[PDB]
Amino acid sequence: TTLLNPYFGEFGGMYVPQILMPALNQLEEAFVSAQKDPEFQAQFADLLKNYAGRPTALTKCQNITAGTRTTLYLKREDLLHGGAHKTNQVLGQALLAKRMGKSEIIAETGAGQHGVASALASALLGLKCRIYMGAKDVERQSPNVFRMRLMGAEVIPVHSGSATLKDACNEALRDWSGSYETAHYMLGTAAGPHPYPTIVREFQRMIGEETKAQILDKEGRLPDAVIACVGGGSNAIGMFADFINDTSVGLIGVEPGGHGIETGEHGAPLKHGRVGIYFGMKAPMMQTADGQIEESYSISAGLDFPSVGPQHAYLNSIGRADYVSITDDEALEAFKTLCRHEGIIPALESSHALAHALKMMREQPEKEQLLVVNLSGRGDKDIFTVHDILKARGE
Amino acid sequence: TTLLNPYFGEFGGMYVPQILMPALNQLEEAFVSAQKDPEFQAQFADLLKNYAGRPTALTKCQNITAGTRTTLYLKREDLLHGGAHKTNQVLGQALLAKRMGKSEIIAETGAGQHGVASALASALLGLKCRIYMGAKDVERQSPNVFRMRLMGAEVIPVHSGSATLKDACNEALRDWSGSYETAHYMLGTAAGPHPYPTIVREFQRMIGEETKAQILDKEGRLPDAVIACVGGGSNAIGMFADFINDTSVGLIGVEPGGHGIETGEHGAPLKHGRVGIYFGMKAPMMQTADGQIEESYSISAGLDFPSVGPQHAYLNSIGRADYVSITDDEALEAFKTLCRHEGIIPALESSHALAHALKMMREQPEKEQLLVVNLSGRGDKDIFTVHDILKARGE
Amino acid sequence: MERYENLFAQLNDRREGAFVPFVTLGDPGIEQSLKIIDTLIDAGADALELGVPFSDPLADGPTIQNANLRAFAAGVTPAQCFEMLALIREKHPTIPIGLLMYANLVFNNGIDAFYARCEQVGVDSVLVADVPVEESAPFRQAALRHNIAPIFICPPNADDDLLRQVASYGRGYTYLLSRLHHLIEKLKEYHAAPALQGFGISSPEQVSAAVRAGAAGAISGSAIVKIIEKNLASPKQMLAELRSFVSAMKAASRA
Amino acid sequence: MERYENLFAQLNDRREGAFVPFVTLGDPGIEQSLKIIDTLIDAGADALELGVPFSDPLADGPTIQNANLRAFAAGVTPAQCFEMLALIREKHPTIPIGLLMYANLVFNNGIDAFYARCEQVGVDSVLVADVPVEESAPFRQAALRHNIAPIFICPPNADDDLLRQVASYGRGYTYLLSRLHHLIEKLKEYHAAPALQGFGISSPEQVSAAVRAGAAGAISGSAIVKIIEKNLASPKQMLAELRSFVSAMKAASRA
Ligand SMILES: O=C(NCCOP(=O)(O)O)c1ccc(OC(F)(F)F)cc1
Ligand SMILES: O=C(NCCOP(=O)(O)O)c1ccc(OC(F)(F)F)cc1
């Protein structure tokens, strides 16, 4: 029995060991209560505003679209405190943890952004934060690891399985299964078992709500489409949620195509994976033919969740949202273009969304279109990555 | 003859070769005109809002002040696009350059933040940007150098003199002296010859204006003091300007004490230098006994301007503002403390201001005081610096 | 087939608890794993619980995580696991054989085809580790259609609703999770499948303790796998240590 | 002392322009710099313009930037520059000696004491490179109190106000910046100090060109310093090349 629907059509659910079900039902109850509580909402709104810096700007990109009939806006989550959208939902989850009387936070992280976000929320709100991160990731992400440590979080390297995000996700769940009385599990995307896909959507939905108000203000109409990159699905569902019932607004999610779909070296499970059951949910995932879970590959480490949020899979199935993919090279070009033409360094994650909007524009330059790209984060973190490619490719 | 006063008491002026005076008078005229032009103001306000992300948050720091009678707010310039306050005034100077019909931008930079800021403003506004940076600085600041290049700016290493900021400042002036018909010189602080101290103040003054509105809103009174770090003086004058006539509000500027004043290895010319004439102005500066110009030393490379804005020297002389210093170690501690207790990674520059506010609190913990620290920038850039010190000091 | 029912009737007749070891199929390789299983049986295992290597065993502690890694290192696949299961059944016609599966491996190529395959190799039960009772309908239905017992974990804190569901939905045995007299009696009250206590069972006194409490017997996982892990360098020493541990554990079930 | 006035009267009598070389004091070292200056005089320099090494010469191109670096490398200080100036005056009683200074070095330890020191060593003029006429009051007043000529740059584009100020405030000579007939005539009209053309003067035909235009003569900076820079490895070759260049330049001023 639950209060809310744990499914989006066929996808989602609560596929967890029996010992973890009380934790999930507890969390769902707290959330339903919090969502009804004006004081919770006021506290959450206050941290968003006065700590995180909301509302974020909606920037019109004139140089980029010059000589086309595309008007392109970027939703500026890169300007949020911590430099990516993840900060929104960790503040809400932190507030939930406090509402339930928990004093400790567990989080998983791959590239480290979610770990950083969880660590800053915990430091602000006085929670003891421990972070699981695959051993290979700890090795590859020294800057985020030191941010987490400077913020007082305990970083725990995970050596099991592939020593990556998949394996930190398992270890987070194993820890929580024994510690949930005192620890909240701060999941890092709109995926995993119910109620996490719903909670994370609702704690990211100010992205789309602001975007709608801002575009009405500046253009007097809704966007023809909103475009967001899809790693696990949080930034994209945050952008999409308030537009779902505005049926003229296209919702386009962009998965990483890596070296190219046909190479198999990609992270596009929604469109190129197969439904499986893992990480507490029924969803498309990267998996072998006999059902072992695989890694997602992208130039962008933040898009390495080997599955996708069940709401995305559902929105795709009924044709409400469309999902596409963008390769490493297309993402690199869009990164280069934004820096040079708009003076904004975008996250390589966010560059997938931008690359798709540039395609929509370039392919049909006389098509009248009003587009918003969710610029989910800033790309300071990616400057060496983009250097050592334009170094190894001469340039 | 000028339209505005080029002096703040005894300090300031226009100490430039005769060939550069027309450039300065032209720039002053354009500025006076722009300051009267509602359309200029509306354009500048629009970029601040929709591109840079203004207004910036005013954050109350509860954890930090727990058990004292200090209430501490941080003005969040770390949340501005580009991650430091410098973005405000480069957008205004870019707009001035366009108003004068110039298509090229010259800028100097030390640690690279001003170079990055000038490069993004230029990329946005379609200006051809060239940046002079001392050869030693180019070597030491690879991340900022690549940001500048990704944004389309030409980075020109300066090998003359000490190959640092002093020497990039000379080279900027030498270039402008021959190129001013087509190039604007985008000076990076509230210093240099008139009209630059005045222009930069006016294009940073939204910092203090917002702070005043926000503190009235949240506390119903003005701050007992506003505290800002002083490298060249821009962030601090931006914070101070709107409070100058509010005579109950203390204005405290914090120079870098480096290894300690008594060591001579510091960057505190306002209080520990000697008045000289250099970089187009009469101001306190770091200089030898026979008047050769020296470098400023700080753990924080952004506080290396070897002089200070003439308005600061003036404000000090009449006792309107007080100036203090903070050592590398005190700055490091304040950096550590903010990360761990507030989940905000501050620039090491900004950490000097914070360190001083922590001193005011800790020294007199039962003193009722309402303080604002200008958090001039974010400290992602400083994470390895702070690592390799807490590494070399065991810890 | 009614192998658990036959075993529990036979055990009750002899005033005896079940001892049920867990191992990972194909740890440390197929050939050695087959010898390990034959040794557990020869030593007095009443039934077997057998794990199929899965990439992300999120219900498992480090010992079992390592067993999986060892099996994957040897190239063990679920298809090879099923060939092994056929051979095991064919040597030992009456011993109940239970699988411990992750949902993806059951769901992967069709829930119904998975349970049909279990029936064909002569498996008796399947516990799907990350399928709670709330999510179990298509699994337990598929199992029952293919004469397979769906096993459910009854956790240490189950409320009455959960006890009633576990009692109603399970067959074969109820997996009683350690981390007490209330749970055993309610399970009996609701006519649940006989309870086996598992999780941290590593000493003979734990086995006697379980039976005394009213559990039908004990499941020991990590303890058996620990012996494998400790003796990788010496296959003969491994079997001998396995033999010794199993008979000790089994003797403790003789009340 | 009236050395520029005496020189210009003597030159006009002989229908001759001035040739005025610039060097940095103490480039490439004190001893060699003294020999360089003696050679420029022996070769026909009508007057000298002498730079004092300053850390941040923001009015100077690369050639002069390097001369400063060379002097600093040799440990040359403004105090040593002043000792050199005393020796130079004492060898050569009538040659006008002008300094090219940066403001900080003038202002450093008191503007008035700086010009008093110039008077004591027998300097005739001081051009302060980064003091425009707008800022010049305390400099030109101090200079005049100490019988020193304050020199001002008249830039290629000066409006009438600037011409009138330069005419009024300067003495000795007006430094006419190259980067034309209008400026010379207006300067004459406003009774300015005689104009010397400088900046890029590097060939004898430039010297004759200046005098023909109505300038009183020519100032050559970088060209002389370039010869120093080219001949660092060979001090004797350096003087000989300096000797040759100076006499060539000076011959061109004989109209
Ligand atoms: O029987 C199992 N393995 C060994 C248990 O014994 P030990 O290893 O001693 O704890 C076992 C049973 C169920 C399980 O998952 C869940 F509880 F979620 F369903 C995980 C392991
Ligand atoms: O006489 C000078 N040096 C040599 C000039 O000759 P050249 O080196 O051939 O250009 C000279 C004169 C003035 C000056 O500064 C300013 F114009 F600003 F006042 C800089 C150099």
Ligand SMILES: *Cc1c(COP(=O)(O)O)cnc(C)c1O
């Ligand atoms: C982590 C991250 C993502 C991908 O996560 P979602 O949950 O799919 O949003 C995208 N963009 C940025 C900047 C990130 O840090």
Ligand SMILES: *Cc1c(COP(=O)(O)O)cnc(C)c1O
């Ligand atoms: C450059 C910089 C400063 C110092 O410059 P001011 O002109 O004195 O403000 C201070 N803080 C930050 C974050 C900077 O980048």
Ligand code: NA
């Ligand atoms: Na994904």
Ligand code: NA
């Ligand atoms: Na300074």
